[PDB]
Write a protein that binds this ligand. Sequence first.
Ligand SMILES: *Cc1c(COP(=O)(O)O)cnc(C)c1O
Ligand SMILES: *Cc1c(COP(=O)(O)O)cnc(C)c1O
Lengths: 166, 166, 169
Amino acid sequence: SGTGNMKFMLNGALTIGTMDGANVEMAEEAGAENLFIFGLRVEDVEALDRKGYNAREYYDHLPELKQAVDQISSGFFSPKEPDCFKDIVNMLMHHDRFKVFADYEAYMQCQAQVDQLYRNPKEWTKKVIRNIACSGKFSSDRTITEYAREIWGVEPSDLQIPPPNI
Amino acid sequence: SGTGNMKFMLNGALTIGTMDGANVEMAEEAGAENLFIFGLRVEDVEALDRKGYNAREYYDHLPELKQAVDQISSGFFSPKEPDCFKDIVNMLMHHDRFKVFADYEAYMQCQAQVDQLYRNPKEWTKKVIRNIACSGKFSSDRTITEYAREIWGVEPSDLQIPPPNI
Amino acid sequence: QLNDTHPALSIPELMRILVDVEKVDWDKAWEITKKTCAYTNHTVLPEALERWPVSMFEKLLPRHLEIIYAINQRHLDHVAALFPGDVDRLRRMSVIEEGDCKRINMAHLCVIGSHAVNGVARIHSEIVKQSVFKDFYELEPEKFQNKTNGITPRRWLLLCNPGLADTIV
Ligand SMILES: *Cc1c(COP(=O)(O)O)cnc(C)c1O
Ligand SMILES: *Cc1c(COP(=O)(O)O)cnc(C)c1O
């Protein structure tokens, strides 16, 4: 699930995300076009595991990524200790189970669409209003009413506490 | 290096190995044809890291290997707890830094050459005699004489302890 | 003879006994140290090499830490003399490494405090020279050697295999 997702949606933020957890039901509530969904889908992740993920192929044929990884590796971001991120780079190339490189291109393209929408203030805030208006489902009142009726066998507001005495 | 390598060579065993450590100097001493050298060379390992190792490609297109891995995975060797080797299989397909699949074909072919030589007792033992005769270098006497002259500045047999008194 | 970095503390401890107990002059004690000690390395790639946090040394061995710091400074002054302005060479060659905490590279301490450094096979010894301690090799090639390992012919032949031993005899 995720609940941070829900907090940003209610407070006027647009969402850049993958099609998993809360993002799915958030897309379904507000329409996927009002969200910046990108990258591998659950089934695509599975299909990449069938092919076998070779992160090297991505690093080799994506120049903006190769430059970024080389800087991290060569010590451009760590001049005094240039091998500080060796284990990060080693992981991204050989043991990356979370397919960071495989989703980089899709993520970059998706961030460009974010950049083009922010460039137009009015259409940015219009999409925001569409998000906020469709977030009502993600109230814990709704969740708790659900638990109460379908699990606990209690009805909300069947107990009415009256004003106290001092 | 390795020293177990040396122990088998002196005691009449033939060696199936990669071109690394002690095996290299053992090949050089007895001639590489008298040893069952196989698989990736140091430089080939490096070249596979440049390509990126995708163990899935090996499992997919090597039928004898696919059958073996599937048995390990499905619980053929562990009927009562069929997910016992899940982490072994997961490692060989996604995190195998030691390139087990990449060397399987070369290793199988090499073991067949071992099988064909054992089928001929006389030529097996001839190769053995060639190994034993060329193992003399791997005496710790040689190593220690080397340390003594090139590092310690002592000469062996410069001290001659005479027969004791009871 | 230091079989790996496990007995690496031999360098600052010999320095300690000579200078603090035996009242020998620092420089003399150091030239004595380097000539008595030799180091054998058994590993490939520099990340397998033994490191200790300096905080651990602050508590357990405060005098050895002081000696290590003095050995390192004098060593980097020498490097600074031979290669002026090479700031990254100083960081690579230092016995003390920076990171999430300061650490003491015991292998670097062994190289600096030994007259000889050997690998255990011909190509491994080439890796020890050219890759593991590249910068140290550039400064003192003659220090670096090879001592291909061996096994004893008594235990690993005469004892375990008397039958084969007799047939050869
Ligand atoms: C809401 C909230 C979370 C939950 O975040 P997820 O990544 O969506 O699980 C975590 N921490 C804090 C402080 C929060 O307020
Ligand atoms: C010789 C010996 C070794 C060394 O084996 P390598 O894999 O060559 O390092 C290890 N254990 C025992 C009991 C030995 O006799």
